[PDB]
């Protein structure tokens, strides 16, 4: 049941992918840490909540 | 049983750590999600959203309503400023507690590009063309329009599209600024003026306001993560 | 459209009403959500709803206020503002639980010599600010719930001091969005502004939002829509100048569970 | 498919222009932000973007263990006239500033909780006696359980409530809790009323306050100290650190920007005034 | 075994 | 392909030399090192070669933990009129100097960080009271966060600080940094200001210190004991070990002659004379 | 849980360990590197460059810019030395403050072979040829021309190509010597003489400089990192 | 031995807690189930059982 | 020897099912901890202990 | 996600390859031990920075 | 091995 | 599984 994954190297040894090693330990997903795998999202809901799509080089009033 | 040897960091608390931990309420029956409009993932997200700037934090108009809005009038033209902005979004008073400025005072380093939204409200009847700078750091910060022109700019004149943007690209020696005041990190100067002069007919207020709006490009990132000096608890 | 269509001119059609505006900047659907009734999957109440369609998700036109130099701002909740309009008002007072998105439609018009711009901001739950420095959390029901006539905005806190007879309502700073956060951000909440040079109205629609899928209308407000002028009313040289801003708004996919005899309120 | 730790885009070389496309023009009015990246306003040179969103997620923000509470219990001499104390809190965000304002930039909140206990004890009196090691007793009292009257009475025995025992001296102790509340998300904030005042009723019988919904939400947690009364004297202290794990956030609003007055959005007179003076035209 | 990712 | 420890080229068996071919010849005037091996000069036997450079690697090299600084806090009676002892350290690796030396053999470096903290604590009056077992709060202040000014004030709730809560007579604390800098690499000197000095503005405006870059530039450690007052004073010193790891280097240095003055390059008079007296002609 | 058992080492903290630990900043947008030239891998790297000798080292000349001169001049011929001077690369004081000497005082044991580079400083017009020499250890360190030229030597002679290069070949009993004085790993004896003598015309200066260099060959290891006495902190 | 790290919540008892421990009978012959009527599965099964109401809760 | 489950997983991070591991250490089943993979059944010995079969929709008594 | 690599074995007991392991515990590369497999490089940049190639038993300057 | 669920 | 080197 090991989960295995990528880490993002950032400063590099003089010394190809370095992974590291997950296992959960308990029954409750409550107590299993953080993936940290995220996502990420546009901001439109916020940014853009207009009813008609906005073109960027045109009028935003017509 | 199993041959073991404790490192250095042994029963430690790091209150960063990522760790199991035993649950105190087992087989719990949790509710499900519903689908909640408005959700977000990342504090990015609403950096990109325009805020409003308090431009004018003079000590009679300083938290009032007043703040937000800077007075334009049809005077003749001069080469003198409307406004004068240092580029610091976290520690300068103006851009500090914008929605911007605030997500920046969680974190110790800023990076990428920066819009400056400018909304005329005055009458239909006014016109007018303003230009709108910015100058990296490094030299006199500018005073006068001769000055701001020589530095990264727009020339906004004022018609049914009432608002106008200026791009603050990213332009810096370091990858990262910092969130604080510091001369080795400083990111220049913001500043407006009339390119011609405000012009009404008769009959029109001859005074009106201008508001402005700040957000982030999407090539913004902030990171290190501490605390803010934007709240507190004595005792 | 080479044909004539524009983002500034537009009709709505909801029930047996009409609105048309040839003044318009576009329109704001909330968060990108349009309102929709609650899905089974995420249903709890089991009963069969009653949804009202075109009695209820019509258009409503509450009282009409007057914009002046001397105006701070004002302030509706949602469902109260609507609480006494026709069928839909019946039927959110005969059911413990309701659920309903808005069409919201802020009306103002001026003239090409007038200035001003009115900022119209729609917030999930728009828990404001009470009176008090010597209890807190204890403005009224009565006073939280104005109904249609809504509440202001005021540039000054000034509190309660009369602790034998507390007037137990709320004191909403205008710079503060009356709870305590500055008014410059509030547009991260769903928004529009009516600019007097550019439009004569906002229009937002707004999906049911709670952290519930359904609940009790009368107990809970959703939705506030706050009305701020962030540049103030000027017109020619009048000292004095005024003019009305009148708000249509209309619920939206409305559906209402746990059918009893009707409450009545003590709303005085 | 876009992860937190991405990249963000690549600048494109852009060169003069003299076009009929205005990007530069725009109006806020319609209620949106105005997409613009420097090349649409200024010429541009190609850059690879190696820059990330990574630590700006919404669980990084979060993933920090904050502190909400104080606990102060004690084990004092048998012969002493006052009680054995006990502490009794209420389970809540709201006591402390700090990660209360960093979950309020969102209305709404689903999350598992992790619980951290640092445990620290001291001597009272400029005695010279000296105790044993203590053990500690952290009970959970979900509402409607009975809560405890006496340092030892029958509801510390914990046959169905969840109890920790921690031993002084030991590594902090830790639990997590799933996401525990009867709405399908966490309220931050309610603009409402527990009740409906009637008409038809008393005035005093149909009132509550103003934005809390359950009188008892989360229960309470009861700390003791289960060593027997030594003649010197003990204080000690348990700090609890709460982190939000798994989190998700809905309906952004603005930061908290004038102290904090209770668990309300209330105001206090004299707290008003955040900002700064500054000049218009002063950099 | 091994879920890899 | 070379590895740090493959073992170095093995000696060629060489024999007598009439030739044109001039090795022992060269110019230095170039500024270039004479590529010279024994067989070049002397007649060698064949030696199959062994050792290895294994352990003069970078890594090797810096794969130890350093001394940087030594952190003195206390906990006092209540009684006393002398506030509580929090320490306060703006972090580098300059306050000492065997480590600094050994970075500055470079003029830029790029690594992750390990710091190890040893806490020790002791009496302080010939009483004879007791405290019990102290915990110690550890707590990172990045550039910008509130520093605290008190032992117990609200910035030590470290809702987004991070922060290390260490029982005394366990294991010492051991966390990693990555690289955190704001460059591409760390630089060991600045050949700099931070400031431009302009003409049109104030001589007191433009002034900024020689080969210093960000006034704060790593931010401070905050340390504290938690424990509440004791009658008995109990004095605690925490030492704070660095290692570099996962480390990389660029452009070498002489290193340091002379007795280190300060943060920058400056020397003492009195100190410049490093040499001892020896004689030209004698061994 | 798991049974297991404590080995002895357990809890303690090494300095030279090698461990994983919790990272304080997790999810850190990490600044990437950027090609700087001049990276070094191996501190060897850095003893194989040519680096000047104080060679001088008498009461008036050390520690100012003379101790690296060592003067020579037209006299007639003697076989007398130049300069005399014991191969312990890391404790001589003419050698022990070099780039190799340096390295080598972080370090207990060092191998290999070692170069020294000798450039004349003189006049074009000027000639010569010098004797330099390398005894191994174990007789008469030699005072006389004579005994020198029994053992490792070069003859020098001047002329366009500047500098010459005597090689010390790794001759040991021991795998590895001390970067100490030690008579059980000591290295022996490098001395310089006049071959003829240093021959100038009229016009033409009669005494001149010549400057020495010592670095390591491509076989020279270093091993069991130490701290130096190079540098101290007295409070 | 193998290197090891010790995580808060280390040493403390959980009551609500799920871990396997030694056996302190070992080898002990246990005695077999037999099919006993009336087993329960769910607390909520009794639930679905109707129960008397105690309406009138008068003082009398 | 291993044995691996699903957890069933309630609150989402913004992060496919999740599993757990467990090995047994002793020889003893009392040692071990509890699985918690329990089974429901239907209440009809409480419930419905009659004779005849009742059909909700028709008369109980006839 | 478990890494094996080579020991250079130095003093060999009176007992082929030995190996040893590492599993990464931490998603963070700077949580990570040193692997201490690490490269040379030829001393060139340093020690013969010419612009001209030299040829050691060829005249330096001609 | 692995008894997998 | 097993990275091997
Ligand atoms: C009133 C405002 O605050 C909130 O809305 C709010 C919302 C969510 C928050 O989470 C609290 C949920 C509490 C659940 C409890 C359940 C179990 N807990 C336990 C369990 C075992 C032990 C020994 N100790 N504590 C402690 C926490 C806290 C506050
Ligand atoms: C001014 C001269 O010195 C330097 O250039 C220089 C360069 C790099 C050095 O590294 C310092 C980087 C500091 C980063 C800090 C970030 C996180 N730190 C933490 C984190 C958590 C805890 C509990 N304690 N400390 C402590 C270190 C130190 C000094
Ligand atoms: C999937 O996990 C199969 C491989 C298991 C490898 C060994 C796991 C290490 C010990 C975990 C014990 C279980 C935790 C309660
Ligand atoms: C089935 O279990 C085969 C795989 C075993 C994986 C490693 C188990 C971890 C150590 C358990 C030791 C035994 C307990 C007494
Ligand atoms: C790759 O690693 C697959 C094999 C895993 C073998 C068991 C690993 C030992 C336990 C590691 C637990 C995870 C660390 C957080």
Redesign the interface.
Known sequence: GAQVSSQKVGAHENSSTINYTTINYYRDSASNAASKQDFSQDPSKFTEPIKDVLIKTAPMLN | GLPVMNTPGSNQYLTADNFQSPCALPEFDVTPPIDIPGEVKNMMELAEIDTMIPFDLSATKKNTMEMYRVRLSDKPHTDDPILCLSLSPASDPRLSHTMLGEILNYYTHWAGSLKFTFLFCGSMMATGKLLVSYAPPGADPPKKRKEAMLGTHVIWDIGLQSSCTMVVPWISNTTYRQTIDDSFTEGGYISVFYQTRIVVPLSTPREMDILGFVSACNDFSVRLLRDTTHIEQKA | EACGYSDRVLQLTLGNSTITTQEAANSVVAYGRWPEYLRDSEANPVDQPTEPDVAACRFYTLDTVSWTKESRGWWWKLPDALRDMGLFGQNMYYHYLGRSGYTVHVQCNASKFHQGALGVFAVPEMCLAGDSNTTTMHTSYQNANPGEKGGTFTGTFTPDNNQTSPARRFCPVDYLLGNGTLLGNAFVFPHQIINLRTNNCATLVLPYVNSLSIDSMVKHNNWGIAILPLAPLNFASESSPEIPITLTIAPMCCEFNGLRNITLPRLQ | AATSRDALPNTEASGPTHSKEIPALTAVETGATNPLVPSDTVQTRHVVQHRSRSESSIESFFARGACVTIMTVDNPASTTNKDKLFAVWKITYKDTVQLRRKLEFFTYSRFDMELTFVVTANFTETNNGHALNQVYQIMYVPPGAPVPEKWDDYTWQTSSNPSIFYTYGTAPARISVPYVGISNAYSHFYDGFSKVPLKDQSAALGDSLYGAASLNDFGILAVRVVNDHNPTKVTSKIRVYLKPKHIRVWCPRPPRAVAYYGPGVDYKDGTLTPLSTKDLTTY | ?5
Chains 1, 9, 10 share one sequence.
């Not at chain 5, 075994?1 to 990712?5: E, K, L, V």
């Open positions: 075994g091994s879920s890899s990712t």
